[PDB]
């Protein structure tokens, strides 16, 4: 029961790879395009960007969030993210932490049982100081929950 991402938009991001993966891969928008074969990648071409990394998504729906999933690059790639965090916001300005979790570069989705929260906006954070590096790649972010009418 993953929610439809068709209305989701990227608000902002710290870093993406806009050139090195071609026009149709590597960008922040590739996190939410529903395409398993594309991924957001942190910048590598022309040099890296320093941690922390964030990506803010406007779902364009208000959602009571039950779980968030991340689908790793996997496939034997170097993608050594260790720790991820999520934040959520009703209004886009006031943010709450909804949990910190582990990451491993497996092929199956990672399922994150976040703090129960209601939000229009979500934020993926790859923090500094916890042994993450500057190499990060994620095929999909998904949300399980219920749209508020």
TrEMBL record:
It comes from the Bacteria. This is Uncharacterized protein. The lineage of its organism: Bacteria, Pseudomonadati, Bacteroidota, Bacteroidia, Bacteroidales.
């Amino acid at each position: 029961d993953k929610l439809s991402k068709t209305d989701w938009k990227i608000v902002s991001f710290t870093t993406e790879e806009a050139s090195g993966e071609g026009s149709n891969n590597g960008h922040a928008k590739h996190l939410i395009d529903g395409n398993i074969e594309t991924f957001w990648h942190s910048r590598w071409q022309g040099g890296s960007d320093p941690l922390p990394y964030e990506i803010i998504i406007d779902m364009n729906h208000r959602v009571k969030i039950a779980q968030i999933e991340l689908l790793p690059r996997g496939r034997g790639s170097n993608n050594p993210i260790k720790v991820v965090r999520f934040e959520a916001s009703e209004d886009g300005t006031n943010w709450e932490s909804i949990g910190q979790f582990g990451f491993t570069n497996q092929d199956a989705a990672l399922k994150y049982y976040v703090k129960s929260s209601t939000a229009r906006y979500i934020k993926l954070v790859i923090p500094d100081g916890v042994g993450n590096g500057t190499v990060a790649a994620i095929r999909e972010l998904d949300v399980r929950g219920t749209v508020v009418n």
